[PDB]
Amino acid sequence: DIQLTQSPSSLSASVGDRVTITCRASQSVDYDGDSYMNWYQQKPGKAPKLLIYAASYLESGVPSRFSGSGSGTDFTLTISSLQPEDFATYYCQQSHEDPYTFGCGTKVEIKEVQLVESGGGLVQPGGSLRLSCAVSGYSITSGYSWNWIRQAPGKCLEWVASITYDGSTNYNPSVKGRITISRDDSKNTFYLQMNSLRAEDTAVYYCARGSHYFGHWHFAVWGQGTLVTVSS
């Protein structure tokens, strides 16, 4: 399990300043001359947004003031000139091998396809949950893979499960045995079934689509997230 160390964990800067964030990986994420490191931006209340994939490639629509660099175990995200709209939390993520892992984020404080989750709510410990991600504006059969990713309260992002276009499923060993992912083409929906829930399963659960390119396991499209609360 590749672990990612993000530094600093938070920082204050002024508009117009250069900002640099570093990500250290506990193991190389290089493969065939490329580095499978990705950067996301998350504003409060919203799902993460993909900024960078394969260490240095800009996602479409991302402003040129964002740049990524590095290789091996050592990676950097640079904002050349901080703008007001850049106050957010920034996450690195490796897509070199499963389980795909995220850093715990850098909070930067200053001075068409749509995915809709349902099925969350308050459950008792030991109970079960079923989440659905309805895909609209896009055929579920067109996607390379569909994923569930959860965000524990005030904590790091955790990839949980995936199903590819050929039906192959994959789970994070942190949850495996209590979790099933499934797909329904005729309803353009996929599902997460959760059983024997524990308190550490309390989180916002996101659905997200994988990519056909550049190692697949970075996530350009996310749902709104649904809150699962396991309490008494």
Residue numbers in the entry: 1 to 111, 1001 to 1121
Paper text:
Instead, the Fab alone selectively crystallized in different crystal forms, but their structures revealed intermolecular Fab/Fab interactions that were clearly strong enough to disrupt the Fab/IgE-Fc complexes.
The scFvXol structure contains one molecule in the asymmetric unit. In this structure, the β-strand-mediated crystal packing interaction observed in the FabXol1 and FabXol2 structures is absent, as the construct lacks the Cγ1 and Cκ domains.
